[PDB]
Symmetry: C6
Subunit: 257 residues, 6 copies
């Protein structure tokens, strides 16, 4: 029931929600700027899904039976004027009252936890150690892990964020493998600055939802500029783990202290 | 209420306020050019909010429950032709009569005071030493300080400017942490877009016309070689600028009501 | 038939399939993002063509006399909102149940197999050793091999993917020579646009969902200095890749149904 | 009464003036190309303002009371085909009959007199020595000079050009401080060539009007490419004074001889 | 009778030929992608002109009298969706049955034969040695050769290709001097890669038509990257001849054998 | 009269002349491609003006009081499909029958004669020695010569070319001082845009078709390193070119009816 083509042309219609093709977010809609795109998470749909999934005796069966409903948690509004009305849009830094965390580390701030670098088999071996519920697979070549793993395959950034948000909000532990297409598709030392603010935007969405989502990221930096890029990433998110040669090279985490 | 999609299509319509979809600012509307965007502050709504906030119990409480007044204080006019009708738009350098200032420095000119460079801890250390009413939080990853500190989180430049304007016109002390998105988001043709400097002069002179000072954290992320030439360009754009090197003041320039002040540290 | 100029203008039309001008893929439609283009494969038409092709006398004769069915197997949807509605679109990694493979290698994951590097004679030599049904020829200057060899000449990326898909689904062995126009046509932000790597990951996962392998000749034309980097980024994008050193296999990497195999020769 | 949004859609409407939304200048309209913008000076409005100001007993009060009318001297035509119809538009080089000048120097050609380089106090020290009527302040941060100086603060290029044109036609001596925002806004050794042709355009508008307007300009050139950028500017305008360390380093002026 | 401004707006109109403003090439239309342009050769008009010229008793008279018909062999379709409908368009490599060639070399594949580098007198002296029927002059300043030579002067790429295609189909021997305006006009080591794909596309039109067209081309590479640029060109066409100091430096040709 | 805003919207309107808003030049219209602009010369209006001017008392007077005939001689067609319909448009190399020339040199091919480089005094001294009827002044700061000398000042490229065309056709000697705005205004992909080279060839061949020579001051502003290469690319674009070094001829090259001439100085 998301408007796909018809957008507000009167003041009366412009006041409706983003879902209906208006330009004013409802209380339960959070806009997420990614590059020059603007997505929206419907926190009512998100919470309906998280609650159904957290309260289920068979969470796997409800998941499979409502994939379409889960994916609809995030969508791209149709109204073209959003960039103008919300200039230099980000997501505000909020933490829900009573938030608590023990994973990925103790008192980990809600937000993103980037897993960067790694052998490739050092990635997958680090993901296996984190006791994840599933791995959301996006933008990566099909390998064995997609065939007989605890995975969920998606096609676009709406589906990736929607599943991670729903799983984490239901109390489970998701990871996204990976933001490869987000590193390639956003363009503006050596890395597009828009990648950093995209990560802060998605990070602060998780912050507002009181969740952590682990995400694999390969910034494709020359190994000279790699320390400066990794530092600009740590400055954008709640936590970051660098893997070099399959071992944890360094981890830096904002904590609630 | 602010027009969002219907803009002037006739000459009679074109002559209305920016709020109404026209192309002619009312006397109480000031345009704010930022890059290829044009915002507007409504000084009537600004005055109404400043009076209400100056008398309320809690400043952080009033803001979170008056979102609809804040969204009306600074907005992005809908009309397209603004860029053409006002070529190379800036904001005029104007100080109100009888303006006074003791913060951030004595006789500090109205405008922006940029806090640039340093570390995240030295940035927190510096603003904590400034007796701010609260820090407006924009464009930065949520951290411990967002839970335990006196903050107000916002999502776009309209909200950041509006909250700072209202707090200052009500006699409070705002800082904005930070203009990260304005550094990343504006892009033109060293190493740093020249439109960043014109955007800061514009926002500076709006603060000037409003007779206020807004402190703003800015990390321009210039090369260590080009850092000093970028810091000179930014200092020439604003009322005041403080450069931090490891929590301490490394350089300062301030325009005052009687002249200029400089500072040298390290 | 495929809509060419009339696209969804109402919400009810937007629910229709891509073929019909809508914005929502039917169950039997898979979107293929290539750079800033979005193609679509109709798996129902694909399954029909593969059954017809498997029962025909000549595979080259069938394709030349069924251009209308091929142009329906892969097309470019007309609706313009596709980029907005599916942000950063990829193709998802799937493997059909009971997929098996003994070519190009044993237990080769479905997807693309890139043949990169080498000379024109070394490339032509290697394809001759692969026991291909025919070579799909696209974007290259006509040569003697187009007269004397088992070939099918095509004009655009739709026809090239359609022919390869129908053949592989019919049990034949296609190779595409080459992706020259895709290398030249996709441009973005080293030395090589990163939209090349995501385009092949997208085409690789379409083959993956179809349970097929398509051999593809690629010459990314990186400076010999950065040539090792680019080959490693391409290997990371696909199921398999072979590098030819002057006619013979210099390197080879393949994702398999069990693990990952590396060949190093030269 | 300047057309703001409605432009010519028929051949009959296209032949009307720029003020009316047409594509053909009236005899009293001069087009001014600046970058990819096209402005227009209405010489009838200009001369009406110059006369009232020059004839007034209290020139200060008349301009205090007629700011809006003065600023309407220069405007941006709404008609969009002007770029096509007048390809590579400039302003023609004319000198009115009987032109005569003793400032900035003797026999100074009408046009711009650029004041380039110098320091912040070196600039203001030079402008004070030129016996100006007022300084038009544009695109610069507010300072003490804007509090208690003989200044007029403006917001855009229409207003800056309008006041200078009217002031100088009335027999007064204006300066613009500065073209900062024009140096920044025009993009195309090391400086945008469009900046050079913009100042030639504005220069030739002044020559057609028989006036000299003094203009502060900082081109932001690296000092390797400095003398060369400065030579390129002198080649675009009537006169140029270079300041360094507050002193007049160099000065070149086209004279009527 | 080519649609110049009115393009298909319905599905029924879209199915018509490129000439009629449709999006679907007829059997006798071949699309030619050049940079971001799409041209089309009408092979029925092509063979009408070629036969009339090959059969005429006074071929010069027939072409003097039918210039406008010859030039209509190639045109630019009006329909705008062609870029979307035919993604990454090329021209398919075909060779007609029974194709034979003895010039420019024995068994020369059909396609373009490029003449690169050299000097002005080196180029001219080479084309004289090839026994050409005429030289098609395009994008070059008028010289003595355009007054007293066996030349046909043209203005755009449609006309240049149209005359070359007709002349060669009729059994004559044309050359195009030159593709200068194509090297300049197509923008994307040192040379725009779109120059290469454009040459391959035009090359393959010739191969489908079973002809060879000789074309002068100056890619204007820096002398270091020149021998790389020449190799990328030879990898795009059937034959290439490098002139340096008026002598044939290098020559590589694909043969039918 | 020239259509300024209404362009062909039907196939019947599309076949009218460029003057009328169509897409097909009349027999007496010649399109002139300059950068991404397309101009047109009307040789019928050109012929009428050239007769009127040839019989008038004063050339400078006739031009100033016939601006309407001039703007009608060269104009920018309104129809937008022109770039598509005429791909990579140039002007064709043609010489009218019986053309002859003693200026600027004997048997000089019709086209442009570029006067390049030097100083402002060397250019002024060189043009003064050329017996020009008048100098067409375009895109230059007004100077003493605009008061004391024989000039016609113009504003855009249309009227600069029109005045030159009318004068040369009526047997007078025009020079354009200068193509500065053309060097600054056309931007493409060394150091100097290749589109500058194609624009001069286009304008050169219009003059060639009109059987006239027009002298044009051009300062391409090349680095002293790349000036050799830039000057050779310009010489290869036009009929004649004269390079001035400090007032004297340093290099010259001219295509003539019988062949070519070179000059070497310094």
């Amino acid at each position: 029931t998301v408007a796909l083509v018809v957008e507000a042309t009167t003041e009366a219609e412009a006041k409706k929600s983003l879902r209906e093709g208006g330009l004013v977010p409802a209380a339960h809609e959070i806009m997420i700027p990614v590059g020059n795109m603007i997505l929206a998470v419907d926190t009512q749909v998100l919470d309906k899904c998280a609650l159904a999934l957290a309260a289920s005796d068979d969470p796997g069966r409800w998941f499979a039976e409502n994939e379409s409903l889960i994916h609809s948690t995030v969508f791209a509004p149709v109204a073209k004027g959003l960039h103008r009305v919300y200039p230099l849009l980000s997501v505000r830094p909020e933490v829900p009252a009573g938030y608590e965390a023990s994973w990925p580390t103790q008192d980990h701030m809600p937000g993103l936890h980037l897993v960067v670098g790694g052998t490739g088999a050092g990635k997958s071996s680090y993901l296996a150690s984190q006791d994840l519920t599933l791995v959301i697979r996006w933008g990566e070549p099909a390998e064995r892990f997609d065939v007989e793993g605890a995975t969920h395959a998606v096609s676009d950034l709406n589906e990736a964020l929607a599943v991670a948000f729903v799983m984490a909000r239901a109390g489970y532990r998701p990871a996204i493998d990976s933001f490869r297409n987000l590193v390639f598709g956003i363009e503006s030392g050596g890395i597009s600055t828009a990648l950093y603010s995209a990560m802060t935007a998605i990070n602060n969405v998780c912050s507002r939802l009181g969740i952590v989502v682990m995400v694999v990221v390969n910034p494709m930096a020359t190994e000279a500029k790699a320390e400066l890029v990794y530092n600009n990433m740590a400055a954008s998110v709640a936590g970051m783990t660098v893997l070099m040669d399959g071992a944890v090279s360094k981890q830096t985490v904002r904590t609630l202290s």
